[PDB]
Ligand binder design. Structure first.
Ligand SMILES: [Zn+2]
Ligand SMILES: [Zn+2]
Lengths: 164, 235, 165, 235
């Protein structure tokens, strides 16, 4: 056994950023083709359905919800199919665009740089009060808690973090 | 919403989870279309986890934390509901978060329950039973539940009820997801004598669980047991 | 069901030092130290049993003195060696906690990885003999502005000194 | 010293390595008491590595580099010898380095070769055969040899000859170490749009290998096969 990492495909893709590079192009492509075939099987199941069970919705309604979910194409006869380019865009959105690393950048917070976490420090917090945490700025409110992520610093903004 | 708001059977109600055997109804809040919040410790979705006591054998992780009283009073449940809703609003306030939440809402578990190919039928485990004001109940489809942690209070995760034996989370169908989460705790990490001690913003933690949830709702998740080794450049 | 995490070696963690040395728990650290203290006692005992030497390259007194110096053995008036617990602990600490990669980075004042684990693929051809490239005193960060922000080690800024393989 | 300097049998000589079967003598330089430098690719110290060709099955590491011509000419061997000597001077220029190098010189492999308890005897593999001007040889104890890399040119390591089957590196005795190293290459790493692309200072790499060597010379190394798992805080 060598030294190194033990990592999960699902975690690496969910965190994104730098770690996503540990999944090789081949495996990325194999996964994508696999799920493209799963989506085609959903389109095929929909196309066979001519009636709907239960009274909670009409078939047309339910078919439309799944055309919208999977971004299926529909021809003039009502048959669905999976368009490769629409699939690729959606699959990219769901596995490479929606990532923890991308949200860090949108929130403009300081965070870990990998999903792996060996820290032991855990804190009780209280985010309901706007004096502690806002929708707009999180802990880094606009006192000097908005510079150098001081709102996230557990020493500087110690009142907001009680160690367990 | 506040925890003490009266039930209406529509967005505030006592509910039961299908397959959660003999459970007493728990109060739940539909904070948005297809998404509900249940301010209770999760003693329901894992048949092997029916109580809040530490395990016989200690979990092999860097840190765990037990307190069977956490999330037991109305005041704590109000604060949990308000904290979770505030994190949703924070995610929704970003273009990326609005996109992700829209994808979640559109990600209705596929109706793959028919054994006859000419009929379309729901998979009834992608539902919750919503008790109405008159005492009756209605089976309602949902995509996502945010629920309190189980015994280990700082263990957050996205899971199906029980285990995904039918591979709904990996076959394109998708299934209703439960995120065990608490907005009342957060992990610390070291970064940058001059090593600053920081805390993870819980909106990022929730977003991570929401990402797992969308993979699992679109049926494109990769089995969490699929792990591989990456060797180091030895020296 | 395998978890995510690190697969790490005691020898590497102790050699690199710094933050990674914390992955070895106090118990294991103490168990290794006692084990090597017992090995040192076995060397002292082997020396005390030896009354002659094989070969003609050295005398027995010379060899005993060299190993008394190597292992910092105490020697009584009869010439018997023993291992002193406090001298051992200081020596063992020097060798395993003072001489570390992390402690060298700090002395050289260079920029370096923060863990022994390395998954990089970038490797460069370098030429350190020329003092215009690399000095004994300063490494690549010579006193042009190669001495600020580790610019001497920056492969873009000091690109002439690093040719990617 | 320069590569073309004439032999004297004392600090510049052609040498052979004990147990390195039918090897042709190689030119070696004693840059300091107990420490030699051999500007040759290491086809000697691993019986299973007698040439410079890439392995049949690719090594499972992030990066490897093969070039059977590297370190084959006098020029390259002069530059290698001078590069290593300069890195030793850099380490020695620090208080920590001066201490480390002193500990290495004092760390003579124990004379634990005797099967008779009343007699002290050398372990004859802790030596090299030093060819003299007259063609004779002298078996000389040494502590450390810095030698060029084997087939993979960027693989640096501290090793015994072959494998440590008597456990001399871990039983308090110590044994002669060989550091496979090249001062001609160095790895890059990313740090701090604003990510700096930096290179490891080879003196640090050499220091890391010297730290292995001192553990192994004092017989307090831990087996490199002794690895353990550290689980992550999953979420
Ligand atoms: Zn090492
Ligand atoms: Zn995760």
């Amino acid at each position: 056994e060598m030294s190194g990492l033990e990592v999960s495909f699902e975690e690496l893709r969910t965190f994104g950023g730098h770690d996503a590079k540990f999944i090789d192009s081949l495996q990325e492509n194999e996964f994508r083709l696999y799920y493209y075939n799963k989506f085609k099987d959903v389109a095929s199941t929909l196309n066979k359905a001519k009636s709907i069970i239960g009274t909670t919705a009409s078939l047309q309604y339910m078919k439309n919800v799944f055309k919208e979910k999977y971004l299926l194409s529909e021809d003039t006869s009502g048959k669905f199919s999976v368009d490769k380019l629409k699939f690729d865009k959606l699959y990219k959105m769901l596995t490479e665009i929606y990532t923890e690393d991308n949200f860090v950048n949108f929130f403009k917070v300081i965070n870990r740089k990998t999903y792996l976490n060996f820290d032991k420090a855990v804190f009780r917090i209280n985010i309901v009060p706007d004096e502690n945490y806002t929708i707009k700025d999180g802990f880094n409110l606009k006192a000097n808690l908005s510079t150098n992520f001081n709102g996230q610093n557990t020493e500087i903004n110690s009142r907001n973090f009680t160690r367990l | 919403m506040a925890y003490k708001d009266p039930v209406n059977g529509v967005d505030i109600a006592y509910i039961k989870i299908p397959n959660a055997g003999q459970m007493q109804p728990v109060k739940a809040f539909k904070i948005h279309n297809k998404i509900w919040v249940i301010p209770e410790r999760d003693t329901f979705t894992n048949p092997e986890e029916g109580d809040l006591n530490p395990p016989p054998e200690a979990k092999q992780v860097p840190v765990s934390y037990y307190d069977s009283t956490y999330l037991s009073t109305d005041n704590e449940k109000d604060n949990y509901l308000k904290g979770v809703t505030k994190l949703f609003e924070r995610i929704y306030s970003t273009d990326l978060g609005r996109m992700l939440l829209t994808s979640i809402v559109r990600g209705i578990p596929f109706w793959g329950g028919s054994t006859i190919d000419t009929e379309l039928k729901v998979i009834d485990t992608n539902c919750i039973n919503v008790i109405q004001p008159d005492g009756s109940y209605r089976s309602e489809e949902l995509n996502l539940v945010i629920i309190g942690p189980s015994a280990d209070i700082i263990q957050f995760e996205c899971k199906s009820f029980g285990h995904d034996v039918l591979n709904l989370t990996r076959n394109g169908y998708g299934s209703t997801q439960y995120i065990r989460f608490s907005p009342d705790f957060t992990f610390g990490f070291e970064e940058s004598l001059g090593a600053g001690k920081f805390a993870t913003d819980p909106a990022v933690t929730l977003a991570h669980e929401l990402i797992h949830a969308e993979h699992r709702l679109y049926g494109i998740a990769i089995n969490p047991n699929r792990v591989f080794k990456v060797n180091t450049n030895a020296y």
